Design a protein around this nucleic acid. Structure first.
Length: 325
RNA sequence: GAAUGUAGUAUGCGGUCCUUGCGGCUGAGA
């Protein structure tokens, strides 16, 4: 029964809610589902369209309705501090003012651990790799796709060796191919499933995954959304990114940002499609940079398709630097 | 070829022992 301890720390406010919408707290079930999704996406490149094999290996690692999960995840210590922070891309409907909407959320920092345990070393390594990929390449909680809930590891104590912590942009980009190679080798050794079937992933996976970098900051206080006015001169990194997103000049589209090149709830069609771009914030050597993770897939959603070049032309317009690939 | 009575199927005996209502699921999408 090997163990692995992860001491997380949120650099941006986390919006993770239980049954009570107003009260926000760290949830083991939500993060476990997120790790399941991240393992499916990260190992999707090794599987491609092999849905059945991916489902089999997922039911092996994380359990199913016929076998208990061999990975047990529990949050032990939570030094949280409930506070109020505004939504990234949601503004109130106030007459004239129309300021942001600030719900309760976990304050930045709030170092809380997260304990991993498993009876098999390989499954523990797989879970740790999926969780570290989730922590690095995205956030957890509400509005995670628009720069919220991202965390970084403050301490590590595990038995099974894992990938080293990146120190700059180049190491972070190389970590993608690293983790992909390690999970591919581990899966081929243990499960011995299909060896990288040649097909674009029908879902969000690492088969077509690109990492982008945009902007840099040195003070965390000037990172998240602070100014409630566009004309304000105290726009932070998140605020400046939102202002650039609002400018229709950068992205070339008929409807601009209001088209279906992003999350489904925009316009007449409600649907449930999320934004392929996963906006996040990463700190590299005490320097904070906006992480723009984009997942390209063969089909956007059953029923319609969209042009992916709008995202890439938008990234090139505001000078987003592609670190991977 | 004639010439019943008296009597409790009763005495003693634990439907008990061993069994996690468990397994799997992002309060999230813009």
């Amino acid at each position: 029964m090997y163990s692995a301890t992860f001491t997380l720390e949120a650099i941006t406010p986390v919006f993770m809610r239980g049954a009570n919408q107003s009260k926000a707290e760290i949830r083991a079930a939500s993060i476990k589902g997120l790790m399941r999704w991240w393992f499916r996406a990260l190992s999707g490149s090794y599987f491609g369209n092999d849905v059945e094999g991916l489902r089999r290996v997922e039911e092996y690692v994380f359990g199913s309705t016929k076998r208990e999960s061999r990975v047990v995840v529990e949050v032990v210590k939570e030094h949280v501090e409930e506070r109020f922070c505004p939504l990234p891309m949601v503004w109130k409907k106030k007459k004239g003012v129309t300021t942001r909407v600030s719900q309760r959320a976990i304050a930045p920092g709030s170092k809380f651990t997260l304990l991993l345990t498993s009876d098999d070393e390989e499954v523990l390594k797989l879970a740790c790799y999926s969780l570290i990929g989730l922590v690095y390449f995205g956030g957890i909680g509400f509005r995670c796709s628009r720069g919220a809930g991202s965390l970084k590891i403050s301490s590590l104590k595990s038995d099974v060796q894992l990938i080293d912590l990146p120190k700059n942009k180049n190491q972070l980009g190389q970590m993608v191919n690293d983790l992909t190679v390690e999970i591919a080798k581990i899966l081929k050794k243990t499960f011995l499933c299909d060896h990288e079937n040649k097909n674009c992933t029908s879902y969000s996976s690492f088969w077509c995954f690109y990492l982008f970098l945009w902007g840099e900051k040195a003070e965390l206080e000037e990172v998240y959304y602070r100014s409630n006015n566009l004309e304000n001169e105290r726009l932070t990194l998140l605020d400046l990114f939102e202002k650039e997103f609002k400018n229709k000049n950068n992205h070339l589209s008929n409807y601009g940002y209001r088209d279906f090149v992003f999350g489904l709830p925009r316009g007449t069609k409600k649907d449930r499609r999320a934004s392929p771009i996963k906006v996040g914030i990463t700190e590299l050597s005490e320097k904070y940079h906006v992480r723009v993770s984009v997942f390209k897939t063969k089909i956007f959603k059953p029923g319609m398709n969209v042009k992916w070049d709008n995202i890439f032309v938008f990234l090139e317009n505001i000078g987003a630097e592609r670190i991977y690939p």
